[PDB]
Amino acid sequence: RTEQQAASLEQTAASMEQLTATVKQNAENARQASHLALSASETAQRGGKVVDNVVQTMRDISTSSQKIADIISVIDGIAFQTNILALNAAVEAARAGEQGRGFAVVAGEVRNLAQRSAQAAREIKSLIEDSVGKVDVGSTLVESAGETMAEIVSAVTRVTDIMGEIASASDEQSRGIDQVGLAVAEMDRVTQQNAALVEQSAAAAAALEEQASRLTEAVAVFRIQQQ
C-alpha cells in the first residue's frame, strides 16, 4: 500500500541531492581552474623574460665569436706578411753568395711555417664561422618559441573568462535548484494531504455504514410493534 507510494519521494529527494551536491562540486573546481589557470599564467610571463635571456646570452655569444674572427684575420695577415719575408730572406741568401747557405735554409724554414700557420688559421676560420651558422639556426628557433608564450597567456586568459562564468551561472544553479526544492516540497505535501483526505473520507464512509446499520437494527427490534 505504501510500497511504490513512498518510493516517489525516493526519486526526487534522492535525485534532488545529487543536484545540490554536484552544484558545489563543479562550482569550486571552477575556482581552482581559474587560479590554477594562473599557475600557467605567471609560468607564461616568467617563461617570457626567461627564454628571453636565453636569446640574449646566446646572442652576445655569436658576437664574441667574431671579436675572434678579425683577430684570426690578423693572425692570417701576420702569416701572409711572413710568407713574404721568406723571400727577402732568400734574396739576401743569394746576394750573400757563399755565406747564404744558412740564410738560404732559414728562408725555406720560414716560408714553411708561414704555410703551416696560415693553414691553422683557415681551419679555425671555416670552423669558427661554420659554427656561428648553427648559433643563428638555434638562436632563431628559441626566438620563435618565445612568442608562443604571449599566446599561452591569451588562451589561458579565457580559461579565466569561461571559468568565471560557471562561477556566476552555476551559482544560479542554487538560486534555481532552490525554487525547485520548493516544488518537490509542495508537491509532496499534496501528494500527501491527498492520502489523508482519502483516509478520513474512507473513514467517515465506514462510520455511516455502521450508524446506518444500527438504525436498521433498532427498527428490526423495536418495530416488533409489527412482530
Add this chain to the structure above:
Amino acid sequence: ASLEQTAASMEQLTATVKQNAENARQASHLALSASETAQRGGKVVDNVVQTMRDISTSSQKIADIISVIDGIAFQTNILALNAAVEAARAGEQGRGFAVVAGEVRNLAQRSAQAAREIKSLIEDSVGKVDVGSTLVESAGETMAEIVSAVTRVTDIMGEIASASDEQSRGIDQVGLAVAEMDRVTQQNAALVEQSAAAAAALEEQASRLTEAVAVFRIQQQ
C-alpha cells in the same frame, strides 16, 4: 502559475547545465590546446640544449688549433733567433739578414699575443655556455611548469562535464515528479468538495432526527 514558474526555472536549469556543462568542455580543449604550444618549447628548447653542448665543444676544438698556432709562433721565434746568429756568423753580409731575422722574430711575437688573446677571449666565451646550460634548464623548466596547470584545466573541465552530464538526468527526473503537483491538487480539491457535501447531508439528516426527538419529547411530556 507557480508549477509553471518552477517548470520555467526547471528547463532554464536544463539550459545552463547544457552550456555551463560543455561550454567548459570547450575549455577542456582551449586547455588541451594551450598544452600544444606548451609542448612546443619541449623541443624548441630541448634542441637548443644540443647546440649548447656543441659550441661548448667545437669552440674547444678551436682552442686546440690555437695552441698549434702558438707552437708555430714559438718555433718561428726560435728560428728567427737562430737566423740572427747566422747573420752574426756572416759578419758583414749579415747586416741585411740581421734585419730579416728581427723582422721574423717580431712577426713571431705578434703571432703569439694574438693567440693568447684568442685564448682568453675563448675562456670567457665558452665559460658562458655555463649560463647557457642554466637559462636552458630554467627557460626549459617554466616550459614544463606551464604544461602543469594545463594538465589540470584539461582535467577539471573534462571532470565537470562528465558530472553535469547527469546533472541533467536528475533535473530531468525531478521535473517529471513535480508535474503532477497541479493535477494532484485538483484531485484533493475534489475530495474536499465531497467532504463538504458529506458534512452537509449529515448536517441536515441529523436535525431531521434531533427535531423528531423533539416532538416525542413534549408529545410525551
